[PDB]
Amino acid sequence: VLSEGEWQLVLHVWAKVEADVAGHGQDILIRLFKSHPETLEKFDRFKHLKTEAEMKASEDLKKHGVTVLTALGAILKKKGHHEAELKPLAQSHATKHKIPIKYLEFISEAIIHVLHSRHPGDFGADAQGAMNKALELFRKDIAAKYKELGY
């Protein structure tokens, strides 16, 4: 459970992310795909992309990055009271997209890295720790739904 102070650190940096949702989403998905190429293979939509320049040039990838970060922002703003948000996300990611929990760890790492690059003044160690806790809570709660469903 995050404290109120931890949530404030999380949402303070998140408010900065929302100034450029699409650029963050691009940076995060590209980092994910480059650092963990098995993740790109899960996207029939994107697996034709073979270089970072091609990824950066894809408007469709930029659009999907907005989709991802909009869903995550809605979750974070619930401050842990996110059952209604995680139900459909866990269902689609477990049963349709077939995404291991480990790949959610990978995207969490990419998120933290990009937030640190773009917002150092609002993403010192205290905020890094708080965002790590928020993304761990996300993963814990998704994992419980995966377990229910046999994934």
- Name the nearest CA neighbour of 85 among 25, 1, 145, 14: 145
By CB under 6 A, tell whether 104 contacts ligand HEM. yes
Residue 36 CB, nearest approach to ligand HEM (Å):
8
Residue 93 annotated as lining a ligand binding site:
yes
Of 2-10, 49-57, 97-105, 124-132, which segment contacts ligand HEM by CB under 6 A? 97-105
The answer to whether residue 72 forms part of the interface with ligand HEM (CB under 6 A) is: yes
Tell me if 86 contacts ligand HEM by CB under 6 A: no
Cβ atoms within 10 Å of 145's Cβ, excluding its own = 17
Contact map string, positions 51 to 70, toward ligand HEM, x by CB under 6 A: ----------------xx--
Nearer to ligand HEM, 5 or 117 (CB): 117
Residue ranges for the known binding site for heme b are: 93
Contacts with ligand HEM by CB under 6 A lie at 39, 42-43, 45, 67-68, 71-72, 89, 92-93, 97, 99, 103-104, 107
